[PDB]
Structure 1
Amino acid sequence: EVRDEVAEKCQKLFLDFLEEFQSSDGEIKYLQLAEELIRPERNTLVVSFVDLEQFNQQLSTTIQEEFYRVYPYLCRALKTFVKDRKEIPLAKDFYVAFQDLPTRHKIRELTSSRIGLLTRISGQVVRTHPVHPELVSGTFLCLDCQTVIRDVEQQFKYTQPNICRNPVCANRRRFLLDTNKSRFVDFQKVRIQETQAELPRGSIPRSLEVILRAEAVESAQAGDKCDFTGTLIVVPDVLSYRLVFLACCVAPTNTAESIKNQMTVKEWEKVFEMSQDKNLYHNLCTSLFPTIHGNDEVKRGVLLMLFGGVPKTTGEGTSLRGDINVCIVGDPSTAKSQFLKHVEEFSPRAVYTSGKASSAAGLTAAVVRDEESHEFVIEAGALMLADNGVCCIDEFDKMDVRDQVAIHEAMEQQTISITKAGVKATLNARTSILAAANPISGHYDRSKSLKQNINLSAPIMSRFDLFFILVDECNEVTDYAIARRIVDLHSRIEESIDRVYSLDDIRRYLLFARQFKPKISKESEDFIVEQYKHLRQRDGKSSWRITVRQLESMIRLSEAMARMHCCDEVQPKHVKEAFRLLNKSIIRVET
């Protein structure tokens, strides 16, 4: 029988914000959001933090400070706001989902001081637990006096009633639970970690467990990067405590016009120059690969892989790949790891790893019992971490059979559906893959077919867009030049590189170029058709034959080379160069 006047005041002003504040048009937007919220499977009401700050800056600041304290009142005010407005079902739970908070903290910044107060954060999911109903308002009854101890809220643990509702009786130990009357809500535990950008080099990220409820339960998935609004809270555990961030709302982690406007004038001028820059193709490869001699076709193909073609979803709902898959087979040494390392070093979203990696994830999503809870959890592997990114996998020859089939499923589908021990889930992974392998017996037998040269299954061969063969040539000139490049790098400790375009400028151009979706000119369409006629007419003998899969790579490559110049339509120049790369990539059996 005690009322928090701050909470009463916050509830009233928040209810006033619901029922008076309005859009630029002058209509109560939140009435419309509530109007849409009346549907089934709709209980979380979105709210803009900046809007209620404008309505009452004190209300927003007080809510920010005492978010956990005031949040039940917000739901109650939402219930009053929504119940009378329409024929909402009399009692279904309702929640308030916040957003528009500028105070985005790193995981390093979380402290006991930040308990209860609202905050926004961003990180990468690691493992996702199954959904589980959790009691919120426990309904109990002492066995002796049989008075219903109603609505004992449990602080995230089996908190029985302290004492009987009957003052006369003090059984204190035999409160039986009412299953139906106790209020429940579904919670899902998820692990997140610091994103690589915020993460200092060589520093272990601050792993964090979070709780997901209402529409947030399935909002994010395993291995994805997302931004979360909510607050940190202690949780007692076996006076011990541990921290968990309850996120009311979950959002993903971050158009050409918006980028170009947001892009500064100097960045715009440079990118504008870069788009105008002819021969950016070779110039970018040289800048991207300073400590490399020769093998520029590999540098060419990787750059196209960095850009990638436009994905397409058919009217039947069938997704068509936008990115691509490229593999390298090379003799011992020969810079394949160096190629992958440079790609990983330059590119965010580019993750390095090895096929020898003995992790239980196996580079991909995995279902594993919790080390403590013993429940199975969908733990994301590095491939899922590279969603909409790149994976620089090493030892691709030396993969495992389990990873091999799962990877084959992934590249075939662009997604992985994982099911075991009753638990089931699916995850999107549109990730360019850079396979690094060595020939069987170490050295590449050009006289033998590629199937003989590598252990990879034919489906792996089919689903890879390109294959580059590196061989230790006895030609001293290349050997001398490589030594010259290496020794100059070592002697000229820095400054040996020749970056005609800075890596940030390179990355900025790729980002802006990625905003474009080049289309196929009917000229280019017949040109592409004409190219495949030559390839079909060529008919290898090639180490591998020529199916429609080759054409699919060709069009995706042409889209990437259309993306190279940021042109909204494809031209024959892109097609012929794409044909040049792939046709040169076809290594004939040298027997």
Structure 2
Amino acid sequence: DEVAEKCQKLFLDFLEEFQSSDGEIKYLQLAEELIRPERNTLVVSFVDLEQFNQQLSTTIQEEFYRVYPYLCRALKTFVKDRKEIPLAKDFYVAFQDLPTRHKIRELTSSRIGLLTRISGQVVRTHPVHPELVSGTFLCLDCQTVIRDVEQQFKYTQPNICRNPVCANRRRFLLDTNKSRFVDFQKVRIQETQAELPRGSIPRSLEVILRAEAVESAQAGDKCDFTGTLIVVSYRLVFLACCVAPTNPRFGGKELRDEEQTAESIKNQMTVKEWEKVFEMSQDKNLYHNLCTSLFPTIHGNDEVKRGVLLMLFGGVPKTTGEGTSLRGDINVCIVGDPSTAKSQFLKHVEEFSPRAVYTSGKASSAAGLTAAVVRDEESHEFVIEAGALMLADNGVCCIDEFDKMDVRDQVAIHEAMEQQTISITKAGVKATLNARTSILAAANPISGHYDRSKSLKQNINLSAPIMSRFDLFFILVDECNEVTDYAIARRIVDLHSRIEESIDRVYSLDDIRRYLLFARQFKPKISKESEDFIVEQYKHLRQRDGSGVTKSSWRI
């Protein structure tokens, strides 16, 4: 058709007319790498193509499956003018940088041929498998070799041979050294728990990438694949191209993976995120004003508001001398409430921080949240399935009611608060991963309330090896005075009578999430006047631990 040919001649001039930063084109440096036959990078920016033409780029994303062979012959002709290339290796369009994102639940029947982008995250990982693209068959009737055999989505066989007398209406023969294959991966994606406000219908979608899109594809990648949905009996498969592991949903573009200077980050961030974190960081009550502005329904108890804010940040995963990362995250848990008022502490964090889960005691068995293993039904092979602790990486997992549970589940999670890693080798299948997820436990008393007659170790079910690996341990303060119920009752009246009017925060929730990425930028150091202050405070808690003679209650 003449419509597809018009979209290729004008696209060839885009790589020479539209400049980049200076008077050079970003595709000029990419042409020097394509000469070496092991790397085929063809990144095309969509936000820059609309500046030169808009009506031309409309038919590209609307009908992409038909212009698929036209993009391979146009880019190969343009690079031929730069430098002569051999005629024995093809390429692949790597169209990325799409500002428009589509939801998995937003799909109909005409989604094929649309060059869009799908979000989500991948859980299951499959090995590479080749694919017959450019092959060569041989007729077993007249002994003639037929070259240039392209396989689309079915078994494309030559119905008419070279001899116009008879043909082979059965099978052929796969060539050996005259057949080019392209390997791919048949990964299994999964809907993210931070984008499902209503309805709980989990499903997946077939995603197939290209040859150079391997390596960076392991169990625990929250990337968003980009490509075009292809329809197969009759199934669905999303043909991807490149990957880009970023933050869940939207968010920033830098956390604990890429490090740069301070002059290159200012050119990418907005101007509204500069003076907001500049004049407010010089105050003296910055650590206290962020406690009331986030929990307006909680009156009093300043010991639980200053620990939840530090839970998101905390320590950093350092590296020892031999190259082994130890700890680097704070853990806390409360006890002294029969699930009557501590439930709101886990709900405010689940809605705020998207990297958080929520489960009860009986809802989590032995595995499920760590790493589940089960033989596949359509492959018959022992695979490894990620849990809830692997999806909430660099975050915090919530868990309530620590009583209605057995003992086999606590043993399988002992390597989470001390090593922050998962090492499960079951059935000769190695699956050693890592996750920096803090455990936000919530212990519950035996008889519901704290008994004053019994000891402090007889009201809880936690033993010594469990509390030794755990970090901070708080207990809810219980006061039986006439002023406690008189002050908490006034906050309940103002909340149920004045709907959406009792909140009097000084900083909205839009700026709280912005200050989460600035903490992971400039890593603080240790002053030379603090080594003498830490060695003199540990000896105080050493004598505070041994109240009797040697041991007592909490071991420090």
Q: Does structure 2 retain, via aligned residues, the 8 Å contact 1:130–1:377?
A: no
TM-score for both structures, normalised by structure 2: 0.79
Change (3 A) 1:504 1:351: farther
Contact 1:443–1:471 (8 Å) recurs in 2? no
Distance of aligned partners of 1:14 and 1:270 in 2 relative to their CA distance in 1, 3 Å threshold: closer
Query: Displacement, 1:363?
Result: 1.6
> Do the aligned residues in 1 keep the contact of 2:398 with 2:440 (CA within 8 Å)?
yes
Relative distance call for 1:304 and 1:195 in structure 2 (3 A) is same
List gaps (5 residues or longer) in structure 1: 547-591
Alignment of 1:382 with 2:375, yes or no, is no
Partner of 1:307 in structure 2? 313
Structure 1 or 2: more strand by fraction: 1
Residues 477 and 180 of structure 1, relative CA distance in 2, 3 Å threshold:
farther
Q: 2-side partners of 1:520 and 1:183: how far apart?
A: 58
1:425, 1:165 → 2: CA distance?
Answer: 53
SS at match of 1:327: coil
Q: Is the 8 A contact 1:360 1:366 kept in 2?
A: no
Give, in angstroms, the shift of residue 304 of structure 1. Answer: 0.9
The structure-2 alpha-carbon separation of the partners of 1:33 and 1:474, relative to structure 1 and needing over 3 Å to count, comes to same
Residues 230, 239 of structure 2: 8 Å contact kept: yes
Give CA-to-partner distance per residue, 1:9-51, whole Å, 9 cap, x none: 6666666666887643444544533544666863444333445
Cα shift at 1:432:
2.9
Report the Cα distance in structure 2 between the residues aligned to 1:363 and 1:375, rounded to whole angstroms: 21
Cα distance in 2 for residues equivalent to 1:178 and 1:288 = 67
CA deviations over 1:120-165 (Å, ceiling 9, x no partner):
3332334333433333345444544454455544444566665656
Q: Higher mean Cα deviation, 445-454 or 151-160?
A: 445-454
Alpha-carbon distance, 1:402 to partner: 6.0
Residue 336 to residue 139, structure 1, CA distance change in 2 (3 Å): farther
Going from structure 1 to structure 2, the CA distance change for 1:403 and 1:132 (only over 3 Å counts) comes to: farther
User: CA contact under 8 A between 2:228 and 2:240: conserved in structure 1?
Assistant: yes
CA distance in 2, matches of 1:100, 1:416: 34
On the 8 A contact 2:125/2:217 being kept in 1, the answer is no
**Corresponding position: 1:97 with 2:90:** no
Are the counterparts in 2 of residues 142 and 172 from structure 1 also a CA contact under 8 Å? no
* Separation (CA, whole Å) in 1 of partners of 2:37 and 2:416: 34
SS in 2 for 1:523: coil
The SS at the match of 1:107 is coil
Q: Is the Cα contact below 8 Å between 1:164 and 1:172 reproduced in 2?
A: no
Pick from 236, 241, 244: which aligns with 2:234? 241
Secondary structure at the counterpart of residue 490 of structure 1: helix
Alpha-carbon spacing, 1:156–1:295, altered in 2? closer, same or farther (3 Å):
farther
In 2, the alpha carbon distance for the partners of 1:454 and 1:332 equals 12
Shift of 1:5: 5.9
Distance of aligned partners of 1:6 and 1:453 in 2 relative to their CA distance in 1, 3 Å threshold: farther
Would the aligned equivalents of 2:416 and 2:437 in 1 still touch at CA under 8 Å? no
CA–CA separation in structure 2 for the residues paired with 1:360 and 1:372: 25
Partners of 1:149 and 1:448 in 2: how far apart?
89
CA positional deviation for 1:465: 2.2
SS in 2 for 1:305: helix
Structure 1 range deviating more: 98-107 or 108-117: 108-117
Q: 1:251 aligns with which of 230, 237, 244?
A: 244
Q: Which moved more, 1:211-220 or 1:137-146?
A: 137-146
Distance change (3 Å), C-alpha of 1:16 and 1:501: closer
- Residues 127 and 380, structure 1, Cα contact 8 Å, conserved in 2: yes
Task: Note closer, same or farther for the CA distance 1:87–1:154 as it changes in structure 2 (3 Å cut).
Answer: closer
The secondary structure found in structure 2 opposite 1:246 is strand
Q: CA RMSD in A?
A: 4.3
Q: Distance in 2 between matches of 1:82 and 1:398?
A: 66
Equivalents in 1 of 2:427, 2:132: separation in Å? Answer: 26
Residue 383 to residue 81, structure 1, CA distance change in 2 (3 Å): farther
Q: Deviations over 1:167-193 (max 9, x none)?
A: 533442333444664432222223335
CA deviations on 1:198-248 (whole Å, 9 max, x unpaired) are 54334646743322232323434334322332222212xxxx633332221
CA 1:529–1:23 in 2, change beyond 3 Å: closer, same or farther?
Answer: farther
- Taking a change above 3 Å as real, the CA distance of residues 364 and 146 of structure 1, as seen in their structure-2 partners, is farther
Residues 531 and 42 from structure 1, CA distance in 2 versus in 1: closer, same or farther, beyond 3 angstroms? farther
Q: CA deviation at 1:251?
A: 0.7
Instruction: Identify the residue that residue 539 of structure 1 maps to in structure 2.
Output: 545
Q: Tell me, yes or no, if the aligned pair for 2:133 and 2:150 is still in contact at 8 Å.
A: yes
- Does the aligned pair in 2 maintain the 1:65–1:116 contact within 8 Å? yes
| Cα shift readout 1:488-533 (whole Å, capped 9, x = no counterpart) | 5445554445534333333333344444433333334443444334
Q: In structure 2, the residue corresponding to 1:213 is in which secondary structure?
A: coil
Moved more, 431-440 or 80-89: 80-89
**2:423 & 2:81 partners in 1: Cα distance?**
43
Equivalent residues of 2:312, 2:395 under 8 A apart? no
Matched, 1:514 2:511: no
Question: What is the CA–CA distance in structure 2 between the aligned matches of 1:39 and 1:359, rounded to whole Å?
Answer: 53
Offset at 1:112? 4.3
Indicate the residue corresponding to 2:258 in structure 1: none
Partner SS state of residue 534, structure 1: helix
For the structure 1 residues 197 and 442, does the alpha-carbon distance in structure 2 shift closer, same or farther, using more than 3 Å as the test? closer
Displacement after TM superposition at 1:267 (Å): 6.4
1:536 deviation in Å?
3.9
Displacement of 1:305: 0.5
Structure 1 residue aligned with 2:257:
none
Alpha-carbon spacing, 1:288–1:154, altered in 2? closer, same or farther (3 Å)? same
Q: Is this contact kept in 1: 2:159–2:168, CA < 8 A?
A: no
Cα distance in structure 2, aligned partners of 1:86 and 1:107: 42
Compared CA separation, residues 462 and 14, structure 1 to 2 (3 A): farther
Report the more deviating stretch, 301-310 or 516-525. Answer: 516-525
Pair 286,367 (structure 1): closer, same or farther in 2 beyond 3 Å: same
Contact 1:14 1:74 in 2 (8 A): no
The gaps in structure 2 that reach 5 residues or longer are: 248-260
* Equivalent position of 2:507 in the other structure: 501
Write the distance in 1 (CA, Å) between the matches of 2:526 and 2:179: 60
Which one is further off, 534-543 or 118-127? 534-543
Contact map agreement 1:45 1:96 (CA 8 A) in 2: yes
CA distance in 2: counterparts of 1:13 and 1:69, whole angstroms? 17
C-alpha displacement at 1:436, in angstroms?
A: 2.0
> Per the alignment, in what secondary structure is the counterpart of residue 138 of structure 1?
strand
Which stretch of the first structure deviates more once superposed, 335-344 or 14-23? 14-23
How far apart are 1:375 and its partner, in Å?
Answer: 5.0
Q: After TM superposition, give the deviation of residue 387 of structure 1 in Å.
A: 1.8
How far the C-alpha of 1:284 sits from its partner, in A, is 2.2
Task: Find the partner of 1:441 among 440, 447, 465.
Answer: 447
**Pairwise mapping of residues 63-142 of structure 1 onto structure 2 (< 5 A)?**
63-75=60-72, 94-142=91-139
Assess if the C-alpha contact under 8 Å between 2:62 and 2:115 holds in 1.
yes
Report 1 or 2 for greater relative contact order, CA contacts < 8 Å, sequence distance ≥ 6.
1
Q: How many residues align?
A: 539
Distance 1:265 1:66, change over 3 A: closer
Amino-acid identity (%) = 100
Shift of 1:249: 1.3
Q: Give CA-to-partner distance per residue, 1:325-347, whole Å, 9 cap, x none.
A: 22233341242322111221222
CA–CA distance in structure 2, aligned partners of residues 492 and 80 of structure 1: 70
Closer/same/farther in 2, CA of residues 418 and 283 from structure 1, 3 Å limit: same
Deviation at 1:83, TM superposition (A): 8.7
C-alpha distance after superposition, 1:84-117 (max 9, x if no partner): 9899998566433222332233334444444223
Q: Distance in 2 between matches of 1:408 and 1:106?
A: 37
